[PDB]
Design a protein around this ligand. Sequence first.
Ligand code: CLA
Ligand code: CLA
Ligand code: CLA
Ligand SMILES: CCCCCC(=O)OC\C(C=C=C1C(C)(C)C[C@H](OC(C)=O)C[C@@]1(C)O)=C/C=C/C(C)=C/C=C/C=C(C)/C=C/C=C(\C)C(=O)C[C@@]12O[C@]1(C)C[C@@H](O)CC2(C)C
Ligand code: A1ECV
Ligand SMILES: CC(=O)O[C@H]1CC(C)(C)C(=C=C/C(C)=C/C=C/C(C)=C/C=C/C=C(C)/C=C/C=C(\C)C(=O)C[C@@]23O[C@]2(C)C[C@@H](O)CC3(C)C)[C@](C)(O)C1
Ligand SMILES: CC(=O)O[C@H]1CC(C)(C)C(=C=C/C(C)=C/C=C/C(C)=C/C=C/C=C(C)/C=C/C=C(\C)C(=O)C[C@@]23O[C@]2(C)C[C@@H](O)CC3(C)C)[C@](C)(O)C1
Ligand code: KC2
Ligand SMILES: CC1=C(C#C/C(C)=C/C=C/C(C)=C/C=C/C=C(C)/C=C/C=C(C)/C=C/[C@@]23O[C@]2(C)C[C@@H](O)CC3(C)C)C(C)(C)C[C@H](O)C1
Lengths: 228, 224, 225
Amino acid sequence: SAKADLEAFAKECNPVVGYWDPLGLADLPLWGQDQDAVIGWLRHSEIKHGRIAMAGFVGYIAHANGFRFGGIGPQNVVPEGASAPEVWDSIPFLAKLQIIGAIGVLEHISEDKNFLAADGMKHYMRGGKPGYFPTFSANVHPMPLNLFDPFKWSKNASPEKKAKGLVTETNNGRLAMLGLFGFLSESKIPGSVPALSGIIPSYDGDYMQPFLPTGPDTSLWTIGNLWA
Amino acid sequence: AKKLNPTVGLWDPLGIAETSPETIGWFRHAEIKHGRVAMAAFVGYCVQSNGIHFPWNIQGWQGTPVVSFADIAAAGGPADQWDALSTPAKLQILGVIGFLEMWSETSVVLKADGQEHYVRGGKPGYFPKLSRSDEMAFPHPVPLNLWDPFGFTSKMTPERKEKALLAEVNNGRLAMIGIFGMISASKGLQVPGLDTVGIKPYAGEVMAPFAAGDASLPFVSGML
Amino acid sequence: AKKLNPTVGLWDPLGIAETSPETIGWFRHAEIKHGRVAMAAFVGYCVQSNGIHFPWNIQGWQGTPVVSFADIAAAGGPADQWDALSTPAKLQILGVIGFLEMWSETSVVLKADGQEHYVRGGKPGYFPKLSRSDEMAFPHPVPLNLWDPFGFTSKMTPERKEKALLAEVNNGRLAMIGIFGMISASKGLQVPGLDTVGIKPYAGEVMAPFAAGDASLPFVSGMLE
Ligand code: CLA
Ligand code: CLA
Ligand code: CLA
Ligand SMILES: CCCCCC(=O)OC\C(C=C=C1C(C)(C)C[C@H](OC(C)=O)C[C@@]1(C)O)=C/C=C/C(C)=C/C=C/C=C(C)/C=C/C=C(\C)C(=O)C[C@@]12O[C@]1(C)C[C@@H](O)CC2(C)C
Ligand code: A1ECV
Ligand SMILES: CC(=O)O[C@H]1CC(C)(C)C(=C=C/C(C)=C/C=C/C(C)=C/C=C/C=C(C)/C=C/C=C(\C)C(=O)C[C@@]23O[C@]2(C)C[C@@H](O)CC3(C)C)[C@](C)(O)C1
Ligand SMILES: CC(=O)O[C@H]1CC(C)(C)C(=C=C/C(C)=C/C=C/C(C)=C/C=C/C=C(C)/C=C/C=C(\C)C(=O)C[C@@]23O[C@]2(C)C[C@@H](O)CC3(C)C)[C@](C)(O)C1
Ligand code: KC2
Ligand SMILES: CC1=C(C#C/C(C)=C/C=C/C(C)=C/C=C/C=C(C)/C=C/C=C(C)/C=C/[C@@]23O[C@]2(C)C[C@@H](O)CC3(C)C)C(C)(C)C[C@H](O)C1
């Protein structure tokens, strides 16, 4: 049932390639946690990686072109044109901290069993759908609109349309991971990706260290700024 | 094919005949594709040496490097012309040929077409057509194909197809000795292929001069 | 419409035909709308290039200042005429065009008129009627209309309507060729340019330059083009 679903999803992703597992990670008990939980973790992590890579590709385009919000906010400290690796280099340190904290809050909400069991769902390792995000409906104070469908125009979708959407999501995620690390590899070593030679400048700081080259400590909050 | 020529029979001095059928199909497809590449190399080298330099490269071909196709064509023998092409051009050409090889090797496409032996064994010499269902589905309808793109071979009897495959094999042999007599004649040697024939590269087997990443190899001077 | 001209047939090299019915309806709607817009643009460009400047622009017609209509017309061809109008004028013209487009796309008004699925789907090219009941109830009776304001098309057979639609489609294809050819002839190019044809804009697709808020774009110099 686990590997059979995995074969079916791989066949729908690509009829020619099909199931491609040269490393055989779909047979390894990752924590002594059977087969169902291991493939659920693998699918959830693949889906999360693909979504983050698609968002990162779009954000890299936006910062490399120069697409600032406006005034007052953290965009005011970032210089006008510094390439996308250096826009996570000039925002204040507390902005990076609070961004990573909000991402962790979103991950925790996506994993908290109260949120999942609120809208009738279980954990992806325990038997839930991988990549699913519970709406908001346990968070003490009410939330205005959900995260998957903020305006809820996808509520009429058929299950076949949802399955095709998941397959397209996975394929686009894989290809966006490849493209985004094409960008990051060309920003580190020249001549890796031949197409991106000369477009992306070289960067010296570490990409895998978040607070390396940490930003300044400025207070952008006006009106009653008792935290000087 | 037992014997196309009745006066030749089966010449197997090395004894590679009378072996496993997988090896038989492997050798048959190797000979067929060797002959096809040999005939393509024959016409390509003859056209390149005679001089049919295409009126092309009007912006975007080598705009940054400033290299017209006439400058590449004015290099001598076709081996020198191949040794004068840029690294992206050679890499993308080899990638296109490799992708065609991957499609010719693919098991699901061959078995959906109606063939067998995705080692490229049984039905030797088949290239899958790039159309219809469950292949090349993501955009790219591919109105043309590889073999019979204009449908010149639309109707053929099995006897005519077998005779044309025998013609394939024999003409591939003839052009294979032809192209190697000709490249050896370019490198001195040979029986008598003077025919100007310009100059020669190192061996024509390097397939990647003046490249980057691992091409810091001065080893093409020796090996006797 | 299978084939208006029997000698051409179904020229679909890109394979966009034999698709989903909504996609085919959207493609037919886009073809008809592009042809009509190209024909109207070609007629307007010919009238502007010949010189049809109106006796207008009086009583504060430019926002307290009074700039003459001939002064806007004394810039060259239509491309220079589209870059001399004020930001409010171009913005309000675009807003009127967008209001007409949104009223055309309105499924409530189309279903009231007795039509099919909107975004110009079934029976594409049908502009909804802005009259009668359950439409424009807040004043604005709209004595005129969009299609046949004078009622010149009061009676027409279905076969005559289909023949006129096929003729309109063929003329729209010819106008989509022609208006693009005229713009290209303005920008050098084309075949037999002649006829002075003035100068051309940066691309013709810049829309509204010299505006405020989002028009600080020096990107209209390059991008090849
Ligand atoms: C971290 C991201 C990530 C994750 C978790 C997965 C997870 C999965 N993939 Mg997957 N994939 C990814 C990225 C990812 N993919 C990318 C970027 C591509 C495009 C190249 C693919 C293409 C792909 C195909 C074609 C198929 C899968 C399939 C699968 C599933 C079973 C295979 C398996 O055990 O894992 C895959 C193996 C790993 C994730 C190995 C981990 C990475 C190692 C440890 C590091 C290697 C780094 C190294 C520099 C790479 C060198 C590359 C090159 C030189 C070879 C599994 C859910 C199968 C499927 O569809 O099932 C639904 C399947 O047939 N994947
Ligand atoms: C992959 C994750 C990621 C990360 C880590 C960052 C990080 C950053 N972005 Mg960012 N961005 C992303 C994705 C990401 N971006 C995507 C996908 C987009 C396209 C919508 C943008 C668009 C964007 C703009 C336009 C700006 C930044 C800016 C910034 C910097 C200041 C923090 C801030 O206010 O962010 C704010 C970023 C967001 C709120 C978008 C991220 C939220 C998710 C990933 C996408 C949500 C979709 C979208 C917001 C829906 C909008 C509704 C629509 C109707 C418009 C910081 C370096 C600012 C800056 O200083 O630039 C130099 C700035 O002005 N980003
Ligand atoms: C605090 C925020 C936070 C938290 C709690 C989580 C939590 C989680 N993430 Mg996650 N994530 C976050 C932020 C966060 N995320 C951000 C900002 C991103 C980038 C957009 C991601 C991207 C991401 C991906 C792509 C994936 C996850 C996954 C996961 C899950 C498993 C992770 C795991 O086991 O690794 C545990 C990791 C650690 C214990 C290491 C933490 C880093 C340490 C603390 C650094 C300290 C080292 C340093 C030397 C110390 C400095 C001081 C020292 C000198 C004294 C879990 C639910 C995975 C998942 O859900 O798969 C199913 C997955 O695939 N996350
Ligand atoms: C007063 C009320 C408003 C206050 C707001 C405020 O105070 O600050 C606001 C502010 C700046 C400011 C200010 C102004 C507003 C300009 C004016 C004020 O001026 C005064 C009063 O003085 C205060 C000041 C200076 O502060 C800037 C806000 C910036 C903001 C909000 C930046 C979000 C980035 C999101 C990112 C990077 C996404 C990451 C990516 C994420 C989260 C993911 O990928 C998540 C996900 O993968 C997960 C985890 C699992 C997957 O399954 C699902 C997906 C794929 C989705
Ligand atoms: C319903 C009635 C109506 C009002 C109340 C206004 C608002 C307004 C004011 C007060 C001025 C003058 C301000 C001033 O000079 O003080 C003004 C102007 C223009 N308008 Mg808007 N407008 C259109 C676009 C346009 C253009 C080209 C100009 C000008 O040239 C002129 C202008 O602002 O010059 C810089 C179109 C064409 C599609 C139509 C229309 O009926 O077609 C269907 C209208 C209709 C209305 N307008 N418009
Ligand atoms: C060596 C060489 O030469 O190769 C080059 C090639 C090339 C291409 C130049 C290179 C590159 C870059 C690459 C590969 C970039 C890839 C980028 C990629 C793949 C980016 C995905 C984005 C997906 C998004 C934003 C998802 C939106 C998702 C949306 C909007 C939704 O969820 C909504 C929706 O889904 C619902 C909810 C359901 C349905 O109703 C459908 C819709 C849409 C309405 C490289 C790296 O240089 C290498
Ligand atoms: C305005 C602008 O900027 O646009 C630019 C775009 C662009 C393109 C940059 C421009 C250019 C220049 C050009 C024309 C560049 C392109 C050059 C091109 C396209 C060169 C093809 C080589 C093909 C080869 C070598 C095939 C070998 C195939 C071989 C050797 C095989 O035998 C294949 C094989 O299959 C057989 C047959 C049988 C199979 O059993 C076995 C295999 C698989 C082995 C321009 C003119 O500047 C305009
Ligand atoms: C920035 C993040 C991000 C990106 C870039 C992205 C891209 C795409 C693309 C384009 C490539 C498609 C076509 C697509 C389609 C679907 N998405 Mg994704 N998606 C993102 C975020 C989420 C989240 C948070 C959830 C989600 C889901 C679904 C479902 C519902 C399936 C179902 O209900 O069966 C479908 C059909 C929900 C889900 O449950 O997934 C298991 C859910 O929670 N998505 N998604
Ligand atoms: C590089 C380049 C070009 C090129 C090229 C390419 C790809 C050229 C490729 C050439 C190629 C593909 C050459 C194959 C040779 C295979 C052979 C000879 C196999 C022999 C095997 C033999 C001779 C076995 C012989 C036996 O005798 C033995 C042992 C005993 C006898 O009793 C019996 C038999 C007969 C069985 C272009 C296209 C020309 C122009 C371009 O500009 C420059």
